[PDB]
């Protein structure tokens, strides 16, 4: 049996978010808090649609992971060590599909991987330039006005 916890983050009303970005309105959305297992760590993701004029990350989708205080925290090791696979799923036709993803190794020396003293860790870990918005028109990443972001954690 597999051991990794996998969360599927459904971001709906995406067309609206894209419209805002195109009108130079900031877009930053947090995923609901989710667990990597039972017992497991509690995390949430933070996704940005950077402004079209954003210096150093114009028109880019940014994606980060943040640790949160979870109910199983007393039974887990700290700081967190392991890998986190972030994927924006291709919802294209039956034939071969090509998702957009990155895999990151946790850096135990960073505060992002410690348990926060408040519900959501201020410090997160991720990619400022995860995927360019232009990539969204290259494949069917948006389906039924929804974007699918997959987060797989391996301890």
């Amino acid at each position: 049996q597999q051991c990794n916890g996998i969360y599927i983050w459904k971001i709906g009303n995406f067309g609206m978010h894209l419209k805002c970005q195109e009108e130079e309105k900031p877009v930053v959305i947090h995923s609901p808090g989710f667990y990597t297992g039972k017992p497991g760590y509690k995390l949430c993701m933070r996704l940005h649609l950077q402004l079209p004029t954003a210096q150093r990350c114009a028109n880019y989708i940014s994606l980060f992971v943040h640790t949160m205080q979870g109910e199983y925290d007393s039974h887990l090791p700290w700081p967190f060590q392991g890998t986190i696979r972030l994927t924006i799923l291709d919802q294209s036709e039956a034939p071969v599909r090509q998702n957009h993803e990155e895999i990151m190794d946790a850096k135990p020396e960073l505060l992002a991987f410690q348990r926060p003293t408040i519900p959501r860790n201020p410090k997160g870990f991720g990619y400022v330039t995860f995927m360019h918005l232009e990539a969204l028109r290259q494949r069917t990443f948006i389906k039924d006005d929804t974007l699918l972001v997959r987060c797989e954690v391996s301890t």
């Binding site: 980060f64 943040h66 990151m104 850096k107 960073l110 410090k123 997160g124 870990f125």
Partner: peptide, 8 residues
């Protein structure tokens, strides 16, 4: 590239 720590 490599991921980075980012504060929000």
């Amino acid at each position: 590239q490599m991921p980075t720590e980012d504060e929000y």
